[PDB]
Paper text:
Arabidopsis glycosyltransferase family 41 (GT41) protein SPINDLY (SPY) plays pleiotropic roles in plant development. Despite the amino acid sequence is similar to human O-GlcNAc transferase, Arabidopsis SPY has been identified as a novel nucleocytoplasmic protein O-fucosyltransferase. SPY-like proteins extensively exist in diverse organisms, indicating that O-fucosylation by SPY is a common way to regulate intracellular protein functions.
Here, we present a crystal structure of Arabidopsis SPY/GDP complex at 2.85 Å resolution. Taken together, sequence alignment, SEC-Mals analysis and enzymatic assays collectively demonstrate that the crystal structure of engineered SPYC645S represents the conformation of wild type SPY. In the crystal structure, two SPY molecules interact with each other in a head-to-tail manner, forming a symmetrical dimer with a length of ~150 Å, a width of ~70 Å and a height of ~75 Å. Eleven tetratricopeptide repeats (TPRs) (residues 44–430) make up a superhelical conformation. The catalytic domain (residues 483–847) comprises the N-terminal lobe (N-Cat) and the C-terminal lobe (C-Cat). A short C-terminal region following the catalytic domain (residues 848–914) is invisible in the structure due to less of density map. GDP is observed on the surface of C-Cat adjacent to the interface with N-Cat. During the model building of our Arabidopsis SPY/GDP complex structure, strikingly, we found that the N-terminal loop of one protomer in a symmetry-related SPY dimer B, encompassing the residues from F20* to S37*, wrapped around the concave surface of the superhelix and traverse the active site of one protomer in the SPY dimer A. More interestingly, S21* in dimer B is located close to the phosphate groups of the GDP in one active site of dimer A, strongly suggesting it is a target residue for fucosylation. A continuous asparagine ladder throughout the inner layer of the TPR superhelix, including N300 in TPR8, N333 and N334 in TPR9, N367 and N368 in TPR10, N402 in TPR11, together with N436 in the connector region recognize the backbone of the substrate loop by forming a hydrogen-bond network. The ‘catalytic SPY’/GDP/‘substrate SPY’ complex structure and mutagenesis studies suggest a substrate-assisted catalysis, where the catalytic base is not provided by the enzyme but likely by the α-phosphate on the glycan donor substrate.
Author numbering:
A (entry chain B): 23 to 37, 49 to 848
B (entry chain A): 20 to 37, 44 to 847
């Protein structure tokens, strides 16, 4: 059997001090209680009143005495029972406290003070359980507290931290949401909600949870840092979707919450650099690296920005600090190698780039820079290899693609068509990557004044300048106007001297540096360009992408590159009947326009200096020499030069090249000559010198210059003939081989043109034979060809401008 | 004839004489092929032991192989066989210099030049060694002897730059900066890549005031050496100084540009960072300015100005805990810093720590005895604490320092209404003197292009910052909801600094009725004035008086031809540009002796219209039935509770026994001012157990409901409550007011009379006290009153806007009447 009970009702409950108490009149109300107890020692309300007063005074031992006196007079008093529990909790008797709360609620279930106090102590019992690992027994103790008081927020919040610790993030959320509903001023709940929303991949909602958290506590540092982190991550997310400025805005806000968050510094350096604001980007990077000494990315990007400023010393130091943090950081190894390539430290540059490639085996630009390095040291086969390996990785790489076509000219003697096919194959693949204009508004009238355009990056002191100063000066702007599209990366006195000249005669000058080739293409239509002539070919910083769109009705290539462009968009190429004879078996994608006499016209800088005495008179021997690229001096050229120097007794050879500062290049260049018979004390490998005056006064040490093949010199022979030193050249089957033919011949020294090796050799030693004839030839040369058609501008412009107007006349009909 | 040496006649020597191995060896030597050349030289010497050029070539080759004393042994045979070979003598002098025998080097250099005066190598090396001797003598203090050694090298080689540079160095430390400049200019002309000369030139130009010249000198220096660190730091210092100079000429933008470029040269130059925070704060870009200040204080922990300006920016964010932290570190670095002392005291004032606030502000006044705004903040402290006479004393102290201080002058006039009874005319004179001063500083518009038709459609401008949950809002809601907008189109100029739900609600209603709402927060009052003229405003009505964020400066320009003041301030404005003032026949009787600057426009019924809170709550029963005692009290400003009010209330609390007082004010959050009020009241005969000082309850609904605690409210005098008595009436709590001489003393008269309860309008103290104890006797009658007051006042003219509206717009066109007539 089971026990059951019927309940009887008791006697009907009978029909200043505490009002002062509610208004915090502790001392006055206390006195009335003390008086009340001496008038009647069994009034429980007086005992409870004094106990609350004494509890304010921190006299807890006395309060437990009188609260117990109240329960012993009148048990089932919710107030007295609840207060004895409050004392039991503050003393540390938590379970005895909850017992007193429970018998209070039995007395009066409506007495919410006991419900709230009980929920608090049960929550504390549950969180003590959680730390002891009894999590499930703790979770239950939480839910009991919520049954007693469903509005106690700490129970919801403590439920959320285990539901997150047990990785039930949805459950942890709903606990935190109701914690925030029962207490809108719960920062910790809002902050922990933001952390979950962040880790789950919605930072916008994480950020609005952090916003609500810091609205309650602006100095909640943990949430402050998490706010910066979330704001930086969302800045990066918005930046990659194309909105750079809003990403920058988020980055700066992230710094408001955390002014030393390095990740926002670095990302602001990246975004400002992309905005071309490099001066400020440098500051952000230094600040990032200051706060984060492990941010090797900031050191790298600083090195890049300082290399674009030509501060190579500081660029090295930045790369060094990057590589001291991440030794296998592929960018900094490559970037350091690029700097060393420029400084001439060839061995170190190769080591740097080789390590960059080991780090990133598909670092295509690293392979292209390696080919650049090999070509600079005059190793064309290996340079082409490094370009071909880059092209295996990126078949559309603009850099290696053009650098490979250019490199192949240094060794192509043109007995097949593989060179022309390589150019043509490149032109097809390149033109498909470029939208082409299929109609042109230009008014078709043959004898209209023509505005012709020259696009080139070489309007500074550069090889092309000496041959593009003659037209700019002696062009007739009245009926052949010129519009110069200058892509000069670093201008100099020559650029402004050109510019001010061009502007004075009535032509246009547009700086196109940093401008995409597609906008340049549409500028060409704005300027109504009739003749668009590019002067770079596949040499560095060319603008062939502009040509690939065909902005002008007619396009020509000239001066810059000794071959075809391979572009079907170009129609013409300006040569002469000697550099490209009419029987040339070399294929070229453009139609060849052969100008009267020479296709070039040299203009010498008047600060060259006078023709200096022939050294053979003061030295007792004849010195041969060349000032061409190391890349042009093939091993078959050293063979021929060694025959020449084995023919002339005690003669000497001198060559000046940039890589000759590095002695690994100089020593190996010597070794190849000593196994070739020529010993070291007869050969002088001079390093590059920086002054132009000193350069053309460095022909003082040379009696005869020897041209290169299959890539013959163009400016170097023109400069040599200007300083009195004659040049024996060799003809060939391709254009790059016969430039020396046309130059020497139209100057008047065609008898110094050789058709083969043996003639080349015999001509050179024949010329070293009579030293007095040398001395007279030296003085005759400068004025011989200053009055030739090689140095006379106005003569050239007529035939060129007549070619331009025939160009125009063909187009007009529809050729 | 005892005499000195005679003149010497010189004869010429034997004629100079009229190759291949010597030429080969010399070219090998010229191209650094030294070991090969040495072989050929040695062969020349065994063929001819006296070949002097082979001796010289051998010595040069051997010297490059670090065999020095053997090279000396070749050069010495060279000088023995040929004593007039300049080349040999110079190589001996070169060796002498390399071996530290600096005197024997100049010895052989001079000997070589005696041999050949045109031998340039001898001149060049001798110039080098002589300047080295000169700098050595300068290090040894023989300054003048060093200067002549420089000029000696300049005589032999006038193209040797280091002589010019070192001359400029000594000239600089001798403070001949013009001589130093010309020396460096020549040094740069002889050597254009002489960076140190450009750097030192910039230092002179900077120290002489010409920054713009200095930065170009540093530019030419760093174009040669981009990594010249002290030239970089000097460039940042100059750029920051020049950015500050041009920022004080008004061009803040490029002043910022100079600061940023300085950071490119020195990324941790704290001075540029702090100045960027100053400029970016002036541009209102407070978030970025915080980062600049934190970076400045990070790189310069001794920059207390960064901590000060940081605290100010976080205080305007209400992050007082962080503001305090900022101010305390600024005082960690500069304990005497007046701004941070004052600012920390401002924060303490807002928090309620009245005496820490007073001590701080006093320390600021010690640091700067003319700190006008510190005196003003002292008065604000005293006014908040309720000590009006000291608040006025603080304002008057500031006005001695700055007679045109706006905060002080307007706070002084407003504070005088709390205590002024109005027997004299000194209050009106103080207002009139302020208006004369204030109009002397605001240019007036003398022409008004507004069309002159008396019954034309006209626009009424309301300009107030109180269009938010503010006392004034409860009285301006009525004209906004009930206005014609047809011939009386209203235009609001809201200067609300922190909008809330009521502001959005007001902006909605005015736009739906057909008016315009223009937020003028932060816009200059003179720009506000011409904005009043753009919007064709015909009658400008200001609602703020001398209370906070008033726009009386706009009014002082007189942008509109007719100007009014209303609601906000219980007195005249003092401005002669304001033409009229809206009041009523009870608050301002026709027989009043209180003098104004504007013409009084008395209106029918009350001059105010109360639109009450929608969610106020219901009326609560009178608590006297539950308590057993009657409760008195007031929810008015502590400032309004003058000590004279306290004495009157004291004898009220003495007449009704076992009754209590309750007063709810913000300054009672500070327990010290709390019980200072109590001890004052105890000496007045009413001890602390019968008084209750309630801190402000920041929730509106709970504040309205707090009237449950009190049976009868007691108006203040001479400044009588305006919202509070309206509020208390709407909660059924009756309020007895006392009338007086001035308008602030008779607001409660107009309110109560026109609400329907003129029997609670006292006429003196004895009236006031006995009417209160009259209603403190019949508790049942009080139960009748509490549930009736609500519906009568809603029916009173005090709460019905449309009737109020036509009365207002009648007076409005009645002023547009006189404007056209002339
Ligand atoms: N939220 C809130 N507002 C209050 C409280 N006490 C007063 N106010 C507001 O402050 C205004 C009273 O300002 P006061 O200067 O005393 O008005 P006046 O003395 O009648 O001219 C009223 O409009 C109330 O809305 C409070 O305890 N809580």
């Amino acid at each position: 059997g089971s026990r059951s009970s019927s309940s009887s009702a008791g006697v009907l409950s009978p029909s200043y001090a505490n009002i002062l108490r509610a208004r915090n009149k502790f001392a006055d109300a206390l006195a009335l209680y003390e008086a009340m107890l001496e008038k009647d020692s069994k009034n429980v309300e007086a005992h409870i009143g004094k106990g609350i007063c004494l509890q304010t005074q921190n006299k807890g031992n006395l309060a437990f005495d009188c609260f117990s006196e109240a329960i012993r007079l009148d048990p089932h008093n919710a107030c007295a029972l609840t207060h004895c529990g409050i004392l039991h909790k503050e003393e540390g008797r938590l379970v005895e406290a909850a017992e007193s709360y429970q018998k209070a609620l039995m007395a009066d279930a409506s007495y919410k003070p006991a419900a709230e106090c009980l929920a608090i102590v049960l929550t504390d019992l549950g969180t003590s359980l959680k730390l002891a690992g009894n999590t499930q027994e703790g979770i239950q103790k939480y839910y009991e507290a919520l049954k007693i008081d469903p509005h106690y927020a700490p129970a919801y919040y403590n439920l959320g931290v285990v539901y997150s610790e047990m990785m039930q993030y949805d459950n942890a959320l709903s606990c935190y949401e109701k914690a925030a509903l029962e207490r809108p001023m719960y920062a910790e709940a809002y902050c922990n909600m933001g952390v979950i929303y962040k880790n789950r991949g919605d930072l916008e909602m994480a950020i609005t949870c952090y916003e609500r958290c810091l609205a309650v506590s602006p100095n909640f540092e943990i949430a402050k840092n998490n706010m910066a982190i979330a704001l930086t991550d969302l800045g990066t997310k918005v930046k990659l979707e194309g909105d750079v400025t809003q990403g920058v805005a988020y980055y700066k806000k992230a710094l408001y919450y955390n002014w030393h968050y390095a990740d926002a510094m670095y990302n602001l350096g990246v975004a400002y650099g992309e905005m071309l604001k490099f001066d400020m980007a440098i500051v952000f990077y230094e600040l990032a690296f200051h706060f984060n000494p492990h941010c090797a990315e900031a050191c790298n990007n600083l090195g890049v920005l300082y290399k674009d400023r030509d501060n190579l010393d500081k660029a090295v130091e930045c790369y060094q600090m990057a590589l001291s943090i991440k030794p296998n950081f592929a960018q900094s190894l490559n970037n350091l190698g690029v700097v060393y390539t420029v400084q001439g430290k060839m061995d170190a540059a190769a080591s740097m780039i080789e390590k960059a490639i080991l780090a990133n085996p598909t670092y295509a630009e690293a392979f292209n820079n390696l080919g650049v390095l090999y070509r600079d040291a005059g190793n064309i086969t290996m340079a082409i290899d490094a370009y071909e390996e880059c092209l295996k990785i990126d078949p559309d790489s603009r850099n290696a693609g053009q650098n490979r076509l250019l490199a192949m000219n240094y060794i192509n003697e043109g007995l097949d068509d593989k060179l022309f096919e390589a150019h043509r194959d490149w032109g097809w693949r390149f033109t498909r990557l470029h939208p082409q204009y299929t109609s042109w508004d230009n008014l078709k009238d043959p004898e209209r004044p023509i505005t012709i355009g020259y696009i080139s990056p070489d309007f500074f002191t550069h090889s092309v300048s000496y041959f593009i100063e003659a037209p700019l000066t002696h062009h007739d702007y009245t009926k052949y106007k010129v519009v110069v599209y200058s892509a000069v990366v670093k201008a100099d006195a020559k650029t402004y001297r050109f510019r001010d000249k061009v502007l004075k005669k009535g032509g246009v000058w547009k700086d196109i540096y940093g401008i995409d080739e597609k906008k340049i293409a549409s500028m060409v239509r704005e300027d109504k360009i009739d003749i668009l002539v590019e002067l770079t070919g596949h040499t560095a910083n060319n603008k062939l992408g502009t040509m690939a769109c065909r902005p002008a009705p007619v396009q020509v290539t000239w001066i810059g590159y000794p071959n075809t462009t391979g572009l079907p968009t170009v129609d013409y190429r300006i040569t002469d009947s000697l550099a490209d004879p009419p029987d040339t078996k070399q294929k070229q994608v453009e139609e060849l326009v052969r100008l009267p006499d020479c296709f070039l016209c040299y203009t010498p800088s008047p600060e060259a200096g006078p023709v200096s005495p022939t050294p053979a008179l003061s030295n007792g021997f004849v010195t041969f020499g060349s000032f061409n690229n190391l890349a042009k001096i093939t091993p078959k050229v050293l063979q021929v030069w060694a025959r020449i120097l084995c023919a002339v007794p005690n003669s000497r050879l001198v060559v000046k090249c940039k890589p000759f500062c590095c002695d690994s290049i100089r020593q190996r260049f010597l070794t190849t000559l000593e196994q070739l018979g020529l010993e070291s004390k007869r050969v002088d490998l001079l390093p590059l010198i920086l002054f132009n005056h000193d350069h053309m006064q460095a022909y003082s040490l040379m009696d005869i210059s020897l041209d290169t093949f299959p890539y013959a010199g163009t400016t170097t022979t023109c400069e040599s003939l200007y300083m009195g030193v004659p040049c024996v050249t060799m003809a060939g089957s391709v254009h790059a081989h016969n430039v020396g033919v046309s130059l020497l011949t139209k100057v008047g020294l065609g008898h110094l043109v050789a058709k083969n090796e043996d003639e080349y050799v015999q001509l050179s030693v024949d010329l070293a034979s009579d030293v007095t004839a040398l001395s007279k030839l030296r003085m005759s040369l400068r004025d011989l060809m200053a009055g030739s058609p090689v140095c006379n501008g106005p003569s050239f412009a007529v035939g060129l401008e007549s070619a331009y107007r025939n160009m125009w006349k063909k187009y007009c009909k529809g050729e």
